[PDB]
């Protein structure tokens, strides 16, 4: 973007850095620089996505000057030319910067480009389209004025006033309060969540410095947890552990997901160090401390499981060749099929401590294919 330098009055360069913020707002950073005199400046502006009021531009077109007017037309805007009973309804076209004449030329092209086909296969309809196209083309000869109406409930559409600071009598601009219909059509204060804050802290056994990574995880659809990942350099002590940070003493949780859709792959997923994972169709269960303490996705976990199991074969307790296991090859094939979306299976996460999460893509509503059972674990066979 070429912009005037206020320090030397040459043209320099403006870079625009845009940031989305919650609740239909945007920050625009305009960073100016001039290579010639070295001057530089930055302005930070905050903008709403939606204006307070809808806008309606009613332009009487009389001259080439009017035809040359720049037009910004948002996707939510309706366009009409009432003298031709013509309408481009909202959401027919994507947002665009054009001109008044450009608008009309694009409409002509939209009708005209397929007329060779239409004239061949639908003669009578094509004849009436040809007749309308001629009416649009006639507007460019400008023997009579016509009206262009652009009505946008978002308020973001724009029609240029080519008469500079002077008045623009040919263009009547009205503003209106949106109906609830208009508001809903547009998808109508702060979101200060901190989903993850991460820091190194002491070794929980040896008090060595900065040996444990601690992640405070505070997502909306799940209780606060702290993930601790140790890997000691001074003592060798290694552990991954998820702990509940809130008041609720967690019960056991058994989550059963029926995997029915490739979309299931992107479900978010925390597995704790006490969470067993089972895929009953594949006769497979993972140890509780395995491949977890990790915030991942279902696809991420399944691919990890595929690597662990099928890419690290061994034999313990017999003389069989670990690289020739029928059941391992069967497992690899079927897991691949689940990952690719070509096979349905149940995925069960069972955590007696309730420190594990699987995204419910229907939240806060129930997922028909996901069942969560809660239970109390009173007995530990390893000694409690
Ligand atoms: Zn300059
Ligand atoms: Zn240590």
Q: What is the DSSP string of 262-322?
A: GGGGG-EEEE-TT-EEEEGGGTEEE-TTTT-SEEEEHHHHHHHHHHHHHSS---SSS---G
**228 backbone dihedrals φ, ψ, rounded to 5°:** -120, 125
Of the bound ligands, which one is closest to the alpha carbon of residue 238? 2
Distance 63 CA to ligand 2 centre (A): 81
Work out the angle at residue 355's Cα, subtended by the Cα atoms of residues 336 and 298, and round it to the nearest 5 degrees: 20
Distance 233 CA to ligand 2 centre (A): 7
Distance 244 CA to ligand 2 centre (A): 23
Distance 240 CA to ligand 2 centre (A): 13
Domain presence at residue 339: yes
Q: For residue 172, give its domain range.
A: 49-188
**Same domain, residue pair 284 and 273:** yes
Of the bound ligands, which one is closest to the alpha carbon of residue 3? 1
Distance 41 CA to ligand 1 centre (A): 11
Sign, CA torsion 120/125/131/133: negative
Alpha-carbon distance values, 185 to 163, 190, 267 (Å): 34, 23, 29
* CB 240 within 8 Å of CB 228: yes
**Same domain, residue pair 59 and 7:** no
**Same domain, residue pair 183 and 215:** no
Measure the CA–CA gap between 98 and 113, rounded to whole angstroms. Answer: 20
Distance 228 CA to ligand 2 centre (A): 13
User: Which technique was used to obtain these atomic coordinates?
Assistant: X-ray
User: Resolution in A, one decimal?
Assistant: 2.0
Count of domains observed in the chain: 4
Domain presence at residue 383: no
CATH of the domain at 238: 2.20.25.420
**Same domain, residue pair 265 and 214:** no
Instruction: Give the count of beta carbons closer than 10 Å to the beta carbon of residue 275.
Output: 28
**Same domain, residue pair 236 and 202:** yes
Measure the CA–CA gap between 349 and 244, rounded to whole angstroms. Answer: 17
The strand order across the sheet containing 96-99 reads 96-99, 70-73, 158-159
**Same domain, residue pair 312 and 370:** yes
Domain presence at residue 384: no
**Same domain, residue pair 267 and 317:** yes
Alpha-carbon distance values, 380 to 274, 288, 353 (Å): 12, 14, 12
**Same domain, residue pair 290 and 364:** yes
Of the bound ligands, which one is closest to the alpha carbon of residue 33? 1
């Amino acid at each position: 973007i070429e912009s005037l330098c206020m320090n030397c009055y040459r043209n320099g360069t403006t870079r625009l850095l845009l940031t989305k913020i919650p609740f239909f707002r945007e920050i625009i950073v305009s960073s100016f620089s001039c290579e010639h005199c070295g001057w530089n400046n930055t302005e930070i502006q905050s903008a709403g996505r939606i204006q307070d009021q809808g806008v309606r531009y009613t332009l009487t077109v009389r001259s080439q000057e009017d035809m040359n007017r720049e037009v910004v037309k948002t996707d939510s805007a309706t366009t009409r030319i009432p003298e031709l009973d013509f309408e481009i309804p909202a959401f027919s076209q994507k947002g665009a910067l054009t001109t008044v004449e450009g608008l009309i030329s694009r409409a002509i092209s939209g009708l005209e480009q397929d007329q060779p086909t239409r004239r061949a296969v639908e003669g009578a309809i094509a004849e009436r389209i040809d007749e309308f196209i001629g009416k649009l083309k006639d507007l460019k000869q400008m023997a009579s004025p016509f009206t262009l109406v652009i009505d946008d409930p978002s308020g973001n559409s724009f029609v240029e006033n080519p008469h500079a600071p002077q008045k623009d009598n040919a263009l009547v601009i009205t503003y209106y309060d949106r109906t609830p219909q208009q508001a809903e059509m547009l998808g109508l204060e702060e979101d200060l969540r901190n989903e993850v804050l991460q820091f190194n802290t002491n070794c929980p056994e040896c008090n060595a410095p900065a040996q444990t990574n601690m992640k405070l995880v505070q997502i909306p659809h799940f209780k606060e947890v702290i993930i601790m990942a140790t890997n000691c350099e001074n003592c060798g002590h290694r552990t991954n552990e998820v702990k509940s940070g809130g008041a609720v003493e967690p019960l056991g949780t058994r989550i059963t997901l029926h995997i029915t859709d490739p979309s299931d792959m992107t479900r978010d997923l925390l597995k704790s160090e006490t969470c067993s994972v089972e895929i009953p169709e594949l006769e497979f269960e993972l140890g509780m401390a395995v491949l977890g303490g990790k915030f991942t996705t279902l696809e991420g976990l399944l691919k990890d499981i595929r690597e662990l199991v099928t890419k690290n074969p061994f034999t313990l307790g017999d003389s069989s060749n670990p690289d020739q296991s029928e059941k391992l090859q069967e497992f690899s094939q079927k897991l691949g099929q689940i990952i690719e979306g070509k096979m349905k299976a149940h995925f069960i996460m069972n955590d007696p401590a309730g420190n594990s999460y699987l995204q419910n893509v229907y939240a806060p509503e129930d997922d028909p294919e996901m069942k969560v059972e809660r239970y109390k674990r009173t007995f530990d066979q390893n000694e409690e």
